Amino acid sequence: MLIAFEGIDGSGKTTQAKKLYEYLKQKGYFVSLYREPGGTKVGEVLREILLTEELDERTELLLFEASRSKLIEEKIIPDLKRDKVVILDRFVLSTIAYQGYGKGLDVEFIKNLNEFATRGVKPDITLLLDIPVDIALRRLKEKNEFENKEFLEKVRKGFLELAKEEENVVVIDASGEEEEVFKEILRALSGVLR
Amino acid sequence: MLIAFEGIDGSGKTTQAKKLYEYLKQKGYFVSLYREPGGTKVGEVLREILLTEELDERTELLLFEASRSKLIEEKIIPDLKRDKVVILDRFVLSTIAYQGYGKGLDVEFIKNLNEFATRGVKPDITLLLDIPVDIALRRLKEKNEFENKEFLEKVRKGFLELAKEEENVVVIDASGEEEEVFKEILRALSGVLR
């Protein structure tokens, strides 16, 4: 089983992916948690490059996809083969929202590149943790992190556009507190999982 | 002006690109020489990863394209804008020959990815240094390097297929000695140097 969390930073998707991981592990599922970019030896080397270097948006996209390619081949496909629940903190929708709607690259091209990196592996469900940018930015300020309002407003709109067209994407109201957000994630997951 | 050398290892394309660089620079052209992968700070970090790590063919392709994206944006496009002669040791045909014909990835997909990485920048001329694999392998043995005959036979065929299809590709007989090969490169270049 594959479960993708998607959303902007400050949307609580790291916290909520961890909550689901612990909850499912308590219920007796064998669980994996991976973050994009990263999650493999080579992927963390690329993560560092993506964080450190000044990178044009095309090179940035290609390196993100390379991290995802490695993760898919090295871990996700074997994990899925032995019936693990695989939880991703970020996956393919975030690439389209950030690189496409945000930095202006072609959305159809990004999807085809996602498909290449994943070898067609799609989530059984995607949870979009939708949140107003102002609220996201407030929660980042509490961690002394600052991101660009104008950029994230485009990205948020991109995410909501993608939710209407893409199948198996449930829009979660991430403006709520942790416990409402998690119960809404549980409800959304009852379709995919008994 | 953009001049691409393409071919398998042991085809003499590194030596001959360097010979052309020196020759054109002596004639008063402003010249650049870049190798793929590599040629930028980030590109050489990726070159090392491509040489060191065991990498699946999809991740490998994406990293090659990332190196090319960086090189194109950071150096080739500015170099071309100020009328430098840019010489490449490997470019887009080598990716298609190695990743497509060699490792079996989709050729149309590789071309679309090449186009994305280069932002449509095409060479004014491509020199295919065509050589029998046995002769290539002999010259690698003299450097204590050993590569796979069965793999390079597919790649060579890929290169010759691409020469018939792609425009501005001149097939050079790289089985010759250095001085014949270089004079044949000079003749092939007389169109672009006029």
Domains, chain B: 1-194 (3.40.50.300)
Experimental method used, please? X-ray
Q: Residues B90, B5: contact at Cβ < 8 Å?
A: yes
The tokens describing B140, both together, are 């690698």
DSSP percent split of chain B into helix, strand, coil, nearest 5: 60, 15, 25
Please state, as a whole number, how many other Cβ atoms lie within 10 Å of the Cβ of residue A61.
Answer: 25
Per-position b or e across B134-151, b if 16+ CB within 10 A of its CB? eebbebbeeeeeeeeeee
Peptide bond into B132 cis (omega under 30): no
Query: SS3 letters for chain A?
Result: CEEEEECCCCCCHHHHHHHHHHHHHHCCCCEEEEECCCCCHHHHHHHHHHHHCCCCHHHHHHHHHHHHHHHHHHHHHHHHHCCCEEEEECCHHHHHHHHHHHCCCCHHHHHHHHHHHHCCCCCCEEEEEECCHHHHHHHHHCCCCCCCHHHHHHHHHHHHHHHHHCCCEEEEECCCCHHHHHHHHHHHHCCCCC
User: Which residue in the set B58, B65, B69 is minimally distant from A56, CB to CB?
Assistant: B69
What is the number of residues in chain A?
194
Contact predicate B126/B170, CB 8 Å: yes
Is the Cβ–Cβ distance between A115 and A126 less than 8 Å?
no
- Whether A110 and A68 have beta carbons less than 8 Å apart is answered as no
Is the peptide bond prior to A37 cis by the omega test (within 30 degrees of 0)? yes
CA distance A146 to chain B (A): 26
Q: Which residue type is seen at A185? A: I
Q: Which amino acid is at A129?
A: L
Nearest CA in chain B to A71: B59
Q: C-alpha angle with apex A181: A177 to A185, nearest 5 degrees?
A: 170
Q: Return d(Cα A121, Cα A68) in angstroms, integer.
A: 11
Between the CA of residue A96 and those of A17, A71, A128, what are the distances in Å?
Answer: 20, 18, 13
Give the whole-angstrom CA distance, residue A167 versus residue A173. Answer: 18
Q: Are B16 and B3 in contact (CB under 8 A)?
A: no
| Pair type for strands A2-6 and A125-130 | parallel
A152/A69 Cα distance (integer angstroms)? 26
Edge-to-edge strand list for the sheet holding B31-35: B31-35, B85-89, B2-6, B125-130, B169-173
CA distance B6 to B125: 11
Q: Taking a C-beta distance cutoff of 8 angstroms, is the pair B93, B166 a contact?
A: yes
Q: Quote the CA–CA distance of A65 and A45 in Å, as a whole number.
A: 13
Smallest Cα distance from B49 to chain A, Å:
8
Chain B residues with CB under 8 Å of a chain A CB are 41-42, 45, 49, 53, 55-56, 58-59, 62-63, 65-66, 69-70, 73-74, 109, 112-113, 116-117, 119
Distance of alpha carbon B97 from alpha carbon A111, whole angstroms:
25
Which residues have C-beta within 8 Å of that of residue A62, sequence separation ≥ 6? B62, B63, B65, B66, B69, B117
Handedness of CA A19, A25, A26, A29 (dihedral sign): positive
Pick from B71, B21, B16: which is nearest to B42 by CA?
A: B71
- Look at phi and psi of residue A144 and say left if phi exceeds 0, alpha if psi is from -120 to 50, else beta: left
